[PDB]
């Protein structure tokens, strides 16, 4: 968001291209909504909810640990689009169709975003 | 002041825009009144209910006020019900369509520009009639078993084509010329993806869809009239790819006599730029200018 | 990284034998000379053809082409050399085309592989192109069969 | 650690442990000294699961 | 045919002006000129789905085509009429030639491919990486016409082999090797991608060593 | 071969051939042509620079006239370890070696710009004869192939 | 546990009402007729609460009041063994790595990587399921 | 090392001198900095080398300073 907000300070493209800016708000929104907000809901849940109900542990301790790693490796896969030459997803976190179709989004960054 | 309460909303150039702006100001006034009450209550308890240095016992431990609670669920319901009624009234007026428009415009959105076509002009006073339908180019797109109801995804027959068309360029902003005081019908069709037809002075926008009929989308909206002449910018609002921010257009509103002269020039083979110059108008868009093709300042 | 302002695809030139040129406001595309060859040189007195397409960047007015000169000979323009408002002016008829022509009467020999300067003037700018010689869809000329050595 | 959680009458949560050696009078096992050999960490590896039953 | 030309221009206006210009002169830093590219370049670029492009990056990838055969011909004719250029081969019925382009000397095509193509596309057209974000895609999906037009027009970073550098008969021999090396089944079992030692070492470690160590566990004891 | 046989943006591998080498029909002719094919320093890449890009060409000292107009001839043997560097990108004008990823700038006299290569590829001077066939205009002014202790 | 399913039955009734109302309101005076995507989602959203609520209704009427369902139960009423809870396991991180390998293969469309990922997931899931059931080594 | 830090301190090699890791880290950063000398024309890689070298130097300096003040042993 700092990169976009710096670019939007002045008219004209000073250091970012259209493609890079499009990739930025897509991934910025994806990270904040799905990689920060949704998991920290369960972040606070594992901290106090067993304490709040007077429980010694969660119902499925191993399934609880599986969620963390599924969440950490899933987030890394989507972010890993930034290391591809084409870049990450650039169709927005809404991923409206048919903009996300292979005709209009042929890059692997969108596919990594989906998976 | 209405401008301060509008929070940047344009005044509007159509009666539908004026009605929409009136609803906006009243709703903002209602929202500000509610916000001031809640902010005042929050500030009141934060300044006068702080813990003093001369209190030893805990405060009264009340946590249930049934008469107050029931009252505080009815008042918000009344406000939204009043707002919903005026909301329904305004949208019915804004979405109303007259069976006899005076100007019909075919809006074709594509990646990444615009194309404007004059489908049909029928002045209510009968001083100008023109049929711009081009059915010998609409039947040339048919592609045909087919994956979708016998048609391939490259059918493209949903698009409309006209004899007089203003085609957008990367170094030439497309300018749509409309007469003032006449009912205008806009038909929106998109070639590839979804785009956005937004004139801020219209105080209204609609998404431009490919295959709008197959998606159950009403791609036709009308304005009763445009109340003043001038040039007004238009922008794309729906994320449509790399150049979603660089496909702006302009709407030029002229007098009925001027519009008739401009159409005759276009029928005489003149381009959009020279036909505008023929009616003592700027040849290029004045509210917006084409973006530099260079990818940035470091190129 | 590769999708920034400096992009490899966006700055690419057409994969053609012609030369792009900017004559103030007119875009010269696919500028090349047609000259069938038999020996190391095309001798003076031979008539070759200069082919190009002129594109009018402006869309308000018109333009006309005048006085094509070069230090290889004299260039003769035949036909209506005016480019329309927002159209093209095809000079020459290249191979694969099912009438403005540029006829060049050679004064000094030319050969395929080198560059020869041509001057284009329309009304608002005079530029040099350094036009090459381009064989089109002509087949490969036969080579005499080598002996046993 | 056997993985079985038990609630004491006063509300304490404790996990049942399987000692690998002698225990105290209080019940806590005597600490053992590391001998460079692997140590069991799963009760099923110590035979607590038994056998299903002889047959096909 | 005037019907084919106006259909091609009508398709061109709403799909190819933003990057190539209204008069096909090219838009600077957005797209090159299309004058003189010919019908062969348009046929390849559209039938392979490479065009219309969607953004600027290291290399524009292939994707499902945006037009059918009739629209490709119309687009090719419109570009062909502006500057001329090479054309796609056609058969007796006027359709795009596919079977007639298969050469009869695959041995010659193999040597030519290894001299001229193997460097970027690999021993058996499996693809290869280029300098910075660019790559030579696998050749197992292109039809003979697409291979012929790619050799003719030289797309992106591939050299534009002319009919004089590579004669029509040499090109037909090359596409015969390309088409046969993709349709020939492996003889020693699963092909493992045909990339050479790199999949072979990966397969060994993940299959034979895993089985050998797993068997060693079963026979041997722990602790 | 003739200059018009290669288009702008094209690359072709060429070999040193003489009239006395023959067409390979005779047994002695075949052996002479076999020696040409298996010569480790023989292959040469001929590239035709696009005429619009001729202003970007930087000449090496002693090699300013080694090109016949827009035709350039560089050795196909990589200067690093001897692999054939034949991955010629027509648009970026980069010569890529598939063995260890060396990259040479064809516009700047094949100067290395990436990889373990530190020396530029040798340039072959070329011209045409009276019949219009491309011929060598002399020998390489530097040794061709991988370097060694006794080099330069 | 009578409150738990009363939560789901309350949600079930509202979802059923919304699904019926939306389907009828889209059948009439709505372009294209019944809007199938939302109607299908709403109808099967009712199904989610219906299955969970019905199961909780059947479980509730079988067993009597639990100590946590009592309005005046004592802490000592819950004395006893609660059940089995896994103390530690590194299998969950292996399952996620196995699943992430398959996703990467599916993202880039590498059938060999997809096949490896599926095999990795099966082996990783087998380890988690069998972790506390493997017997001692037999020699 | 003590058994409180490494429980199996008497069962194998469990101590590495801090000077080896500190000097190795400084040589680690120096090797990253000398690699900017080459035939590459871009500078994206150079900034990556500078950042990694700076991170390594900062870690080495922090560890050395904390050991000097006595906060860590
Ligand atoms: C101790 C190690 C530590 C390091 C320090 C110690 C060593 C540092 C000290 C020196 C040292 O390194 O020595 C070891 C080396 O020794 C011998 O190398 C020497 C010399 O160094 C080489 O550079 C040189 O190149 C060799 O000449 C060959 O090319 C010559 C031409 O070249 C010149 O031109 C090249 C390119 O240009 C031209 O290219 C082509 C050439 O025609 C043409 O295209 C064209 O003409 C072009 O020219 C243009 O020029 C102008 C353009 O402007 C214009 O005019 C025109 O346009 C024109 O076109 C450049 O690239 C070159 O650089 C160079 O300048 C030809 O002239 C020759 O005929 C021949 O082919 C030469 O060999 P010679 O003379 O045959 O023998 C002599 C003797 C060595 O003397 C010693 O001191 C030995 C003792 C010291 C070394 C250690 C041994 C003793 C210790 C004990 C044994 C230990 C117990 O031999 C030997 O006893 C060697 C025996 C084997 C070694 C045993 C080691 C022990 C074994 C066990 C370990 C070779 O054997 C090498 O293999 C060996 O490594
Ligand atoms: C997928 C999600 C399925 C699991 C959700 C069920 C939650 C129930 C909670 C529970 O009991 O947790 C058990 C337990 C949680 O650990 P814990 O906290 O120690 O629980 C102790 C219990 O209290 C004590 O319980 P237990 O030790 O007796 O074990 C209980 C377990 C015992 O169940 C078994 O006997 C074996 C079932 C194992 C699952 C098989 C996975 C199949 C994958 C196929 C891949 C190829 C396709 O029963 C179940 O988990 C019931 C689920 C029935 C299986 C249905 C799964 C079919 C998958 C459909 C694919 C589409 O985890 C498991 O054993 C299963 C979860 C593993 C999920 C794998 C994630 C990857 C899936 C991606 C597949 C795509 C491939 C491409
Ligand atoms: C597309 C590419 C795919 C690549 C992968 C494919 C590679 C093929 C190689 C196949 C490996 C063959 C080795 C199996 C030997 C047979 C042993 C036997 O008869 O069972 C007795 C044996 C236990 O006998 P024991 O030594 O007396 O037991 C001592 C303890 O109780 C031991 O208990 P513990 O507490 O030490 O731990 C028990 C451990 C024991 O499991 C292992 O140790 C096997 C894991 C192999 C990895 C070895 C290297 C590890 C490096 C990482 O089990 C696990 O925790 C996970 C194993 C899950 C079963 C695998 C399911 C197969 C589905 C494949 C799809 O149980 C097994 O190991 C059964 C494994 C089942 C393998 C299925 C055969 C695959 C055939 C497909 C070929 C294609
Ligand atoms: C005890 C242990 C000992 C045992 C060990 C033995 C294990 C081996 C088992 C398998 C043996 C099979 C024998 C048959 C061989 C055969 O007859 O072969 C058929 C053909 O098939 C392929 O043709 C495809 C099409 O048919 C063509 O039409 C198409 O053209 C072609 O495309 C190529 O060519 C195009 C140009 O033409 C290019 O455009 C394109 O790109 C590509 O190159 C295609 O090929 P391709 O895509 O390669 O794969 C396609 C594969 C899909 O992948 C795969 O098999 C993946 C799976 C195996 C591969 C190897 C493992 C990979 C390991 C990696 C390391 C994973 C990474 C992990 C990372 C972690 C660590 C990293 C740090 O589908 C299939 O076969 C489906 C079959 C699945 C069968 C599964 C076996 C069941 C076993 C069950 C056992 C039960 C026992 C119980 C006992 C109690 C090509 O091979 C052809 O040549 C070949 O001819
Ligand atoms: C605090 C922690 C982390 C903080 C980091 C977050 C902020 C970082 C800020 C970086 C800036 C972001 C900008 C992004 C947008 C962008 O980039 O667009 C710029 C343009 O630039 C390039 O064009 C150049 C021109 O504009 C063209 O005009 C010109 O022609 C062209 O010239 C080339 O090309 C020509 C062809 O035309 C050739 O002719 C010519 O010869 C030449 O080759 C130019 O190119 P070039 O020099 O390559 O510069 C490319 C980019 C370069 O990118 C980059 O940021 C590289 C990324 C570096 C990030 C650092 C790595 C960190 C690693 C981990 C953190 C370690 C793990 C930690 C351990 C755990 C923790 C334990 C404690 O420069 C820059 O932006 C400026 C760099 C300044 C960044 C400073 C950061 C240094 C690190 C300091 C850290 C100190 C820490 C100490 C702690 C105590 C092309 O790309 C264009 O398309 C592109 O458009
Ligand atoms: C911008 C996003 C583009 C759109 C939309 C279209 N084209 Fe394009 N094209 C673009 C670039 C940057 C390039 C050059 C590099 C590349 O990817 O090849 C091209 C290339 C072509 C070519 C090849 C030209 C050659 O030199 O032979 C052709 C024939 C071509 N483009 C045609 C084409 C058509 C018909 C399009 C509408 C469907 C079209 N392009 C869209 C950029 C963009
Ligand atoms: C490296 C410099 C190459 C050489 C030598 C050859 N090819 Fe190539 N080829 C290369 C690239 C980078 C590309 C992709 C270009 C694009 O515009 O996207 C191609 C493409 C092809 C294709 C099209 C493949 C498709 O996607 O189906 C074909 C059929 C093809 N190349 C064949 C081919 C042949 C026969 C060659 C020898 C004459 C050859 N290529 C050389 C890179 C390079
Ligand atoms: C933290 C990652 C920020 C990435 C910024 C650069 C975006 C373009 C990369 C692609 O191309
Ligand atoms: C003519 C422009 C006047 C500026 C009006 C500003 C209004 C500010 C409102 C602030 C509301 C905060 C909740
Ligand atoms: S061989 Fe060319 S890079 Fe090493
Ligand atoms: Ca800016
Ligand atoms: Cu848009
Ligand atoms: Cu848009």
3-state secondary structure chain H: CCCCCCCCCCCCCCCCCHHHHHHHHHHHHHHHHHCCCCCCCCCHHHHHHHHHHHHHHHHHHHHHHHHHHCCCC
Q: Do E61 and A106 touch (CB under 8 A)?
A: yes
Nearest CA to F46 out of F66, F23, F61 is that of F66
DSSP G76: G
In this structure, what token pair is assigned to residue E213?
């160590």
Closest atom, ligand 5, to C-alpha of A17: 97
- d(Cα B106, Cα B197) in Å, to the nearest integer? 12
- Total length of chain F: 152
E52: cis peptide before it, omega within 30°?
A: yes
How close E206 comes to chain D (CA, Å)? Answer: 27
- Cβ-proximal residues to H35 (8 Å cutoff; 6+ apart), any chain: H49
Residues 6 or more apart whose Cβ sits within 8 Å of residue C16: C30, E33, E35, E36, E37, E83, E85, F8
Q: Kindly give, in sequence order, each residue whose CB lies less than 8 Å from that of residue C135, ignoring residues fewer than 6 positions away.
A: C17, C36, C112, E164, F4
Report d(CA B286, CA E36) in Å as an integer.
Answer: 36
Count of structural domains within chain G = 1
CA distance C60 to C55: 13
| CA-closest candidate to residue C65, choices C28, C105, C18 | C28
Please report how many Cα atoms fall inside a 13 Å half-sphere around the Cα of residue A46, on the Cβ side.
12
- Per the DSSP assignment, residues forming a β-bridge with B167 are B115
Tell me if B168 sits within 8 A of B113, measured CB to CB.
yes
Beta-carbon contacts of E135 under 8 Å, excluding residues fewer than 6 positions away, are: E59, E127, E128, E129
- How many CA atoms lie within 13 Å of B251's alpha carbon, on the beta-carbon side? 22
The number of helix segments (H) and strand segments (E) in chain C equals 0, 13
Nearest CA among E43, E90, E39 for reference residue E65? E43
Q: Which H or E element spans position E180? A: helix E168-183
Q: By C-alpha distance, which of F143, D30, E56 is closest to B296?
A: E56
Mutate to test the pocket of ligand 7, among E53, E59, E120 (most ligand atoms within 8 A of CB): E120
Question: What's the CA gap between E135 and C96, in Å, rounded?
Answer: 32
Reported residue count of chain B is 299
CA distance E85 to chain F (A): 13
Q: Measuring CA to CA, which residue among F73, F147, F85 is closest to residue F114?
A: F85
CA B74 to CA B87: how far, in whole Å? 20
Asked if C102 and C49 count as a contact pair (C-beta separation under 8 A), the reply is: yes
Ligand nearest to the CA of B39: 9
Closest CA to B268 of B176, B175, B164, B178: B164
| Residue F102 to residue F97: CA distance in whole angstroms | 5
Closest Cβ–Cβ partner in G89, G97, G128 for A73: G97
Distances (CA, A) of H44 to A88, E145, H47, H51: 18, 41, 5, 11
Task: Give the chain H residue whose CA is nearest to the CA of D36.
Answer: H11
Q: What is the greatest pairwise CA distance in chain C?
A: 68
Pair B231, B287: CB distance under 8 Å: yes
Cα-based torsion angle of the residue sequence B11, B16, B22, B26 in order, rounded to the nearest 10 degrees: -130
| CA–CA distance, B133 with G86 (Å, rounded to integer) | 74
Residues of chain C positioned with their CB less than 8 A from the CB of B298: 5-6
Please give the method by which this entry was determined. cryo-EM
Resolution at which this structure was determined, Å? 2.6
Domains of chain C, residue spans: 13-149
Task: Show the beta-strand stretches assigned E in F8-139.
Answer: 11-14, 44-48, 71-75, 87-89, 94-96, 103-105, 111-114, 126-128, 134-136
Range(s) of the domain holding residue G25: 1-139
Give the CA distances from residue B84 to residues B23, B36, B88, B148, in Å, rounded to whole numbers and listed in that order: 11, 22, 6, 40
Residue whose C-alpha is closest to residue A72's, from G86, G89, G98, G93: G93
Residue B64 has, within 13 A of its CA and on its CB side, a CA count of 1
Report how far residue E156's alpha carbon sits from residue B290's, in angstroms, rounded to the nearest whole number.
28
Q: Are B17 and B202 in contact (CB under 8 A)?
A: yes
DSSP E208: I
What's CA B197's distance to the chain center, in Å? 5
| G13 within 8 A of G61, measured Cβ to Cβ | no
Task: Locate the ligand 8 atom nearest the alpha carbon of residue A88 and give its number.
Answer: 10
User: What is the number of residues in chain G?
Assistant: 139
Phi and psi at residue B268, to the nearest 5°: -80, 15
At residue B91, φ and ψ (nearest 5 deg) are -65, -30
Residue B296 CA to ligand 11 center (angstroms) comes to: 9
Give C1's Cβ-side CA count (13 Å radius).
13
Nearest Cα neighbor of A8 from A23, A27, A21 is: A21
B/C interface, count of CB pairs below 8 Å: 24
Dihedral through CA H36, CA H40, CA H42, CA H46, nearest 10? -20
- β-bridge partners, B205: B198
User: Going by beta carbons, is chain B in contact with chain E, meaning 3 or more pairs sit under 8 Å apart?
Assistant: yes
Which H or E element spans position G137?
none
**Between the CA of residue A86 and those of E46, E50, F17, what are the distances in Å?**
20, 15, 45
Please tell me the distance between residue A59's alpha carbon and the centre of ligand 3 in angstroms.
29
Instruction: Give the tokens for residue C35.
Output: 């000259």
CA distance E115 to E111: 6
**Which residue from G minimizes the CA distance to A107?**
G108
Question: Which chain B residues have a beta carbon less than 8 Å from that of C5?
Answer: 295-299
The residue count for chain H: 73
Q: Which residues from E are below 8 Å from D37, CB to CB? A: 223
- What's the Rg (C-alpha) of chain D? 15
Domain boundaries, chain H: 1-73
Chain C residue closest in CA terms to B297: C5
Of C8, C39, C141, nearest to F92 by CB-CB distance is C8
CA distance D34 to chain G (A): 21
Q: Does residue E79 contact residue E88 with C-beta atoms inside 8 Å?
A: no
Angle B244-B245-B251 (CA atoms, 0-180°, nearest 5)?
Answer: 100
Cis-peptide into F91, omega within 30 deg: no
User: B263: helix, coil or strand?
Assistant: helix
Say if strands C73-78 and C66-70 run parallel, antiparallel, or are unpaired.
antiparallel
C15 is in an annotated binding site: yes
> Which atom of ligand 8 lies at the shortest distance from residue A86's CA?
11
């Amino acid at each position: 968001a700092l990169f976009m907000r710096t670019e939007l300070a002045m008219p004209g493209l000073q250091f970012l291209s259209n493609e890079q800016f499009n990739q930025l708000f897509t991934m910025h929104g994806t990270v904040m909504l799905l990689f920060y907000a949704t998991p920290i809901v369960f972040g606070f849940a594992n901290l106090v909810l067993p304490l709040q109900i007077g429980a010694p542990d969660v119902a499925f301790p191993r399934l609880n640990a599986l969620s963390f790693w599924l969440f950490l490796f899933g987030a890394l896969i989507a972010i890993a689009g930034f290391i591809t030459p084409g870049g990450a997803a650039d169709f927005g976190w809404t991923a409206y169709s048919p903009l996300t179709d292979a005709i209009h989004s042929p890059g692997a960054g969108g596919d990594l975003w989906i998976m | 002041w209405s401008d301060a309460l509008a929070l940047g909303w344009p005044t509007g150039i159509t009666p539908e825009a004026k009605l929409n702006r009136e609803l906006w100001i009243g709703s903002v006034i209602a929202s500000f009144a509610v916000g001031a009450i809640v902010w005042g209550l929050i500030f009141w308890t934060s300044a006068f209910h702080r813990k003093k240095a001369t209190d030893t016992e805990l405060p009264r431990q009340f946590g249930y006020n049934m008469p107050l609670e029931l009252t505080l669920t009815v008042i918000p319901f009344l406000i939204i019900s009043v707002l919903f009624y005026f909301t329904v009234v305004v949208q019915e007026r804004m979405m109303h369509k007259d069976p006899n428009p005076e100007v019909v415009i075919d809006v074709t959105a594509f990646q990444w520009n615009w194309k404007f076509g004059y489908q049909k002009i029928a002045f209510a006073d009968g001083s100008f009639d023109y049929d711009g339908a081009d059915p010998e180019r609409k039947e040339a797109m048919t592609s045909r078993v087919g994956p979708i109801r016998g048609m391939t995804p490259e059918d493209r027959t949903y698009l409309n084509f006209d004899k007089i068309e203003t085609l957008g360029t990367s170094s030439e902003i497309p300018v749509l010329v409309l007469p003032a005081g006449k009912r205008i019908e806009f038909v929106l069709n998109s070639a590839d993806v979804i785009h956005g037809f937004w004139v801020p002075e219209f105080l209204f926008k609609r998404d431009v869809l490919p295959e709008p009929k197959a998606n159950n989308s009403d791609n036709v909206f009308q304005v009763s009239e445009i109340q003043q002449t001038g040039a007004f910018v238009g922008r794309c609002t729906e994320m449509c790819g790399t150049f979603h921010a660089m496909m702006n257009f302009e709407v030029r509103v002229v007098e009925p006599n001027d519009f008739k002269a401009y159409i005759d020039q276009r029928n005489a083979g003149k381009t959009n730029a020279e036909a505008l110059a023929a009616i003592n108008q700027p040849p290029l868009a004045i509210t917006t200018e084409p973006f530099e093709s260079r990818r940035g300042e470091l190129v | 990284c590769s999708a920034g302002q400096i992009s490899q695809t966006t700055t690419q030139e057409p994969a053609v034998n012609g030369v792009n040129a900017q004559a103030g406001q007119v875009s010269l595309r696919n500028v090349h000379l047609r000259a069938p060859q038999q020996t190391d040189y095309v001798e003076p007195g031979t008539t070759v053809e200069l082919l190009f397409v002129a594109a009018n960047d402006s869309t308000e007015g018109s333009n006309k082409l005048k006085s094509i000169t070069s230090d290889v000979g004299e260039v003769t323009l035949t036909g209506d050399s005016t480019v329309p408002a927002d159209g093209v002016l095809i000079v020459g008829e290249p191979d694969g085309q099912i009438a403005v022509t540029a006829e060049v009467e050679l004064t000094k020999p030319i050969t395929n592989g080198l560059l020869y300067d041509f001057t284009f003037t329309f009304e608002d700018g005079e530029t040099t192109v350094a036009v090459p010689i381009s064989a089109g869809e002509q087949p490969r000329r036969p080579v005499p069969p080598a002996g046993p050595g | 650690e056997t993985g079985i959680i038990k609630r004491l009458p006063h509300g304490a949560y404790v996990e049942l442990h399987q000692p690998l050696g002698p225990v105290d009078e209080h019940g806590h096992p005597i600490p053992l000294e590391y001998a460079g050999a692997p140590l069991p960490k799963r009760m099923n590896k110590l035979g607590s699961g038994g056998a299903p039953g002889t047959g096909s | 045919q005037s019907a084919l030309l106006r259909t091609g221009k009508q398709l061109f206006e709403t799909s190819c002006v933003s990057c190539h210009g209204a008069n096909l002169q090219g838009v600077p830093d957005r797209g090159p000129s299309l004058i003189g590219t010919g019908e062969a370049a348009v046929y390849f670029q559209v039938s392979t789905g490479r065009m219309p492009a969607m953004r600027g990056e290291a290399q524009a990838p292939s994707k499902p085509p945006h037009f059918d055969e009739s629209q490709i011909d119309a687009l090719g004719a419109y570009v062909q009429a502006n500057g001329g250029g090479p054309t796609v081969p056609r058969d007796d019925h006027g359709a795009v030639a596919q079977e007639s382009l298969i050469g009869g000397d695959v041995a010659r095509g193999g040597d030519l491919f290894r001299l001229n193509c193997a460097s970027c596309h690999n021993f058996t057209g499996k693809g290869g990486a280029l300098s910075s974000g660019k790559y030579a895609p696998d050749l197992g999906d292109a039809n003979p016409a697409q291979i012929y037009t790619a050799m003719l027009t030289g797309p992106q970073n591939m050299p534009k082999f002319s009919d004089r550098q590579l004669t029509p008969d040499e090109k037909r021999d090359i596409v015969a090797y390309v088409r046969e090396s993709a349709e020939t089944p492996s003889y020693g079992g699963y092909g493992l991608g045909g990339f050479g030692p790199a999949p072979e070492g990966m397969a060994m470690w993940i299959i034979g060593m895993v089985a050998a160590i797993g068997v060693a566990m079963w026979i041997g004891s722990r602790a | 071969m003739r200059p018009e046989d290669i288009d702008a943006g094209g690359m072709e591998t060429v070999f040193p051939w003489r009239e006395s080498d023959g067409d390979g029909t005779t047994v002695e002719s075949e052996h002479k042509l076999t020696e040409i094919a298996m010569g480790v320093r023989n292959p040469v890449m001929l590239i035709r620079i696009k005429p619009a890009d001729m202003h970007r060409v930087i000449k090496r000292k002693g090699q300013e006239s080694f090109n016949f107009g827009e035709l350039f001839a560089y050795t196909k043997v990589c200067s690093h370890l001897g692999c054939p560097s034949s991955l010629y990108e027509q648009q970026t004008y980069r010569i890529l070696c598939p063995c260890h990823q060396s990259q040479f700038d064809a516009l700047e006299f094949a100067k290395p710009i990436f990889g373990p290569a530190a020396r530029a590829l040798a340039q072959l001077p070329i011209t045409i004869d009276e019949d219009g066939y491309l011929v060598a205009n002399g020998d390489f002014v530097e040794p061709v192939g991988p370097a060694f202790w006794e080099r330069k | 546990m009578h409150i738990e399913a009363r939560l789901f039955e309350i949600l079930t009734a509202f979802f059923a009402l919304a699904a019926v109302v939306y389907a009828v309101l889209t059948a009439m005076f709505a372009t294209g007729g019944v809007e199938w995507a939302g109607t299908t989602a709403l109808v099967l959203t009712t199904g989610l609460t219906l299955i969970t609520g019905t199961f909780f209704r059947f479980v509730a009427r079988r067993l009597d009041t639990r100590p946590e369902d009592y309005e005046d139960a004592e802490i000592s009423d819950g004395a006893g063994e609660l059940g089995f809870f896994a103390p530690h396991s590194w299998w969950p991180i292996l399952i996620s790595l196995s699943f992430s390998t398959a996703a990467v293969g599916a993202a880039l469309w590498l059938p060999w990587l997809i096949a490896a990922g599926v095999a990795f997931v099966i082996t990783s899931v087998c380890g988690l399921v069998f972790e506390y059931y493997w017997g001692p080594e037999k020699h | 090392v003590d058994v409180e830090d490494v429980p199996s301190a008497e069962w194998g090699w469990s101590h590495m001198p801090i000077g080896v890791m500190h000097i190795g880290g400084l040589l680690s950063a120096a090797f990253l900095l000398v690699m900017m000398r080459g035939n590459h024309v871009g500078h994206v890689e150079d900034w990556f080398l500078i950042g990694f070298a700076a991170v390594i130097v900062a870690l080495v300096g922090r560890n050395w300073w904390l050991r000097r003040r006595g906060w860590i042993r």
